[PDB]
Design a binder for these strands. Structure first.
Length: 785
RNA sequence: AAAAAAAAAUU
């Protein structure tokens, strides 16, 4: 365990901007809360059941134990009261019926809310976790009884609204709620929310949606296989059951040992029911005919959404910032005996605060002249500018996997002609026509074609691949190119070939130049923070998880002092589940490539860590710090550069709004790029800040939250905020400030790519590891661009 | 995959 650094001070750089945040002040008195352990048997019942078990225990045992107490309870083992229960330190056993439960209640501790207030007043080092937890349980007791909790959110069925997603799924709306420490006062973070549920409906209706069926003959081959995969694991009601599988033969014929009896007869002997769909199968739970079953209401959709379900939901849930602002405000302003029990009061107005809009860097371009760009509202363009270091492309090939019918030769020639012209304008001149331009079909053609190209065209620098929409070909192109043969590839969808655009072509060149080792632009050097006065390396790290399938760890590192070029490392691995297991070897590799490229080891390591929750970040940071130092020692004994460890988070629900309407930007009306907050809603003592580095395009922007868990380098607040913002302008794929620093974003791209490498075109842990190994001809290139 | 942003316990 360790102490993260204190906030070194408040930032003062940038234009002041009046803001509102969806943090609502919580008034807490200087009182105890009394904490009791709750032991319910039978053991693991669903959390919602424990809540009603305890809720009914409280009411039935009123005169004997609870009296006028309104206890907070988390649905697990934690109960909180404003005054001690009449039971001393003794474990008291009770019994309650709904099934009969046995519940034990026992004093475990006094929790001090005054101690929490002392920490918020700066009088204390650490914010006490027991107090924050008590407050969370108390303030979320009522909505937990009234709504359907999902994580820290609460949802309600779509009463009187029709919001379909397809595949038997629907949108439920609700809100996120969390308690957060701030200076002086606790805050309640409230944000509107929405998520996907299975609609409560007849199984037969569900079956028709999933299985392509317009209207009402037994099922078929691959109908039933997909109908299963969508219904397996769901609760149905007729009492409730769980679906193991569906049956292969119809209810008319599906037997079970009773005699030997089949399903249809069984339900007219008892239920006196003539099946209207005896030709339909049964759900295995063990057999229930479809027409007797309904999906049970309130089941979260856990499976991944299709791409269009995802779209539908965003369009149903993405509102402009001022619209989101008004919805939050109205939600909060629209009785709570658990709050009253502890004299807790929640203010119904958003917190007002002042942030700063940081100045954006200037970017240096090159080629024909030392041209420059600086963003306006988070965006700039490459018009009339050439790359700082542009690659000359002399040998390149085109492979079109779209049908010639769909992408005629004159369409293809026009595409390559235009791409040549744009590339020359950008200072990455594609010299002459492709050495190879052919049509092909199917992923199976990729490997022999690329082998042939590598064999035949010495100096081949690039293969441009035209794809026919979503296809297995993409994953195979990257497998062969990145891992098998080490050949740079740039894919492009046929729709962007047959219907071209200069912006699209220009953006392609951004990626191609980076892939081939060019430098698109650099931060203007003398305007970087002072950290660049000595060799410094920037690392970005992330871990992606599957929804069996492996987790993937990615760490990227700058390879020059600009910083523009980055090298990647990636691993397959199986709170300690979040730690990057091979971090020492990965960081070692990146340090060595930096050393090789610049001829210096860095005196400082700046490490941006994505993919970790607030609750686990300290537990993750400590072993990762040890691992980074071990990597340093492996390059040279006693080599101890200063490390700054910064967690980047954007899955939180803090939202910032312009207090002054005239300062809203664009149709979405968001805060401007550069908007930074390091007071009022941030941590009372630790070193954290919000920075909305990007321009909001649609809906409400999510400002990234940065938490400094370690800092040998003693950054000032301004230096680190400015550094972080400038790194958001070095991302090669667009001339825009992006929402997280380039190295953190690359780490995600590297992890996503590894997923494609793991696809099996039609496994052992060492096999998984070799699958994501990049070929050496590309291992130190920006293949992930 | 031009790109960013944007939603998440009888049969």
């Amino acid at each position: 365990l360790f102490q993260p650094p204190r906030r070194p001070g408040l930032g003062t750089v940038g234009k002041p901007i009046r803001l509102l945040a969806n943090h609502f002040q919580v008034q807490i008195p200087k009182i105890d809360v009394y904490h009791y352990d709750v032991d319910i048997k039978p053991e693991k019942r669903p959390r919602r059941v424990n809540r009603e078990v305890v809720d009914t225990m409280v009411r039935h045992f009123k005169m004997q134990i609870f009296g006028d107490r309104q206890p907070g309870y988390d649905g697990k083992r934690n109960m909180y009261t404003a005054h001690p229960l009449p039971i001393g330190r003794d474990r008291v056993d009770m019994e309650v019926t709904l099934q009969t439960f046995k519940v034990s209640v026992q004093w475990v501790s006094v929790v001090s809310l005054q101690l929490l207030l002392e920490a918020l007043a700066g009088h204390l080092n650490e914010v006490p976790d027991d107090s924050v937890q008590a407050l969370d349980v108390i303030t979320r007791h009522l909505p937990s009884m009234r709504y359907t909790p999902v994580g820290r959110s609460f949802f309600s069925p779509p009463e009187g609204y029709y919001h379909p997603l397809g595949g038997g799924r629907e949108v439920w709306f609700g809100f996120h709620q969390s308690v957060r420490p701030a200076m002086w006062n606790m805050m309640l973070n409230i944000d509107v929310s929405a998520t996907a549920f299975y609609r409560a409906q007849p199984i037969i209706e569900f079956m028709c949606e999933v299985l392509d069926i317009q209207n009402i003959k037994p099922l078929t081959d691959s109908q039933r296989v997909k109908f299963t995969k969508e219904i397996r694991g769901l609760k149905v009601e007729v009492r409730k059951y769980r679906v193991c599988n569906v049956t292969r033969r119809p209810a008319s014929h599906q037997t079970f040992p009773l005699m030997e009896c089949t399903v249809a007869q069984y339900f007219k002997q008892k239920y006196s029911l003539q099946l209207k769909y005896p030709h339909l199968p049964c759900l295995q739970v063990t057999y229930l005919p479809l027409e007797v079953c309904n999906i049970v209401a309130g089941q979260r959709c856990i499976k991944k959404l299709t791409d269009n379900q995802t779209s539908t939901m965003i369009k149903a849930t993405a509102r402009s910032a001022p619209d989101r602002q008004e919805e939050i405000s109205r939600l909060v302003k629209s009785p709570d005996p658990y709050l009253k029990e502890f004299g807790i009061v929640v203010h119904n107005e958003m917190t007002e605060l002042t942030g700063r809009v940081l100045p954006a860097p200037m970017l240096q371009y090159g080629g024909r002249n030392k041209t420059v760009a600086t963003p306006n509202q988070g965006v700039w363009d490459m018009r009339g500018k050439q790359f700082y270091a542009g690659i000359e492309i002399k040998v390149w090939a085109v492979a079109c996997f779209a049908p010639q019918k769909q992408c005629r030769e004159d369409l293809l020639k026009s595409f390559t002609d235009q791409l040549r012209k744009i590339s020359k304008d950008a200072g990455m001149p594609i010299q002459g026509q492709p050495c190879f331009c052919k049509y092909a079909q199917g992923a199976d053609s990729v490997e022999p074609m690329f082998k042939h190209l590598k064999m035949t065209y010495v100096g081949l620098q690039l293969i441009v691949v035209i794809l026919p929409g979503k296809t297995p070909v993409y994953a195979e192109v990257k497998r062969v190119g990145d891992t098998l043969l080490g050949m740079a590839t740039q894919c492009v969808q046929v729709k962007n070939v047959v219907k071209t655009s200069p912006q699209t072509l220009s953006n392609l060149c951004l990626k191609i130049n980076a892939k081939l080792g060019g430098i698109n632009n650099v931060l203007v050097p003398h305007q970087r923070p002072s950290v660049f006065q000595q060799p410094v390396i920037f690392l970005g790290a992330d871990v992606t998880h599957p929804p069996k399938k492996p987790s993937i760890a990615a760490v990227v590192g700058s390879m020059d002092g600009h910083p523009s070029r980055y090298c990647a490392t990636v691993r397959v691995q199986t709170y300690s589940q979040e730690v990057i297991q091979d971090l020492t070897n990965m960081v070692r590799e990146l340090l060595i490539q930096f050393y090789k490229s610049t001829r210096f080891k860095p005196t400082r390591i700046i490490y941006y860590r994505g993919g970790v929750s607030e609750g686990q970040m300290k537990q993750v940071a400590w072993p990762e710090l040890i691992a980074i130092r071990k990597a340093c020692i492996s390059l040279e004994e006693d080599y101890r550069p200063g490390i700054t460890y910064i967690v980047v988070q954007k899955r939180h629900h803090t939202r910032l709004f312009c207090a002054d309407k005239t300062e809203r930007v664009g149709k979405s009306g968001n805060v401007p790029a550069g908007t930074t907050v390091d007071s009022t809603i941030t941590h009372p003592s630790e070193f954290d800040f919000y920075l909305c580095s990007h321009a909001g395009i649609q809906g409400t922007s999510r400002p990234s939250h940065y938490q400094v868990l370690w800092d040998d380098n003693c950054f000032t607040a301004d230096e680190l905020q400015l550094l972080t913002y400038q790194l958001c302008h070095t991302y090669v794929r667009c001339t825009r400030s992006v929402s997280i620093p380039a190295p953190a974003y690359y780490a995600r791209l590297v992890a996503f790519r590894a997923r494609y490498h793991l696809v099996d075109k039609d496994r052992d842990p060492q096999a998984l590891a070799k699958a994501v190994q990049i070929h050496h001809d590309t291992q130190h290139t920006m293949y992930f661009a």
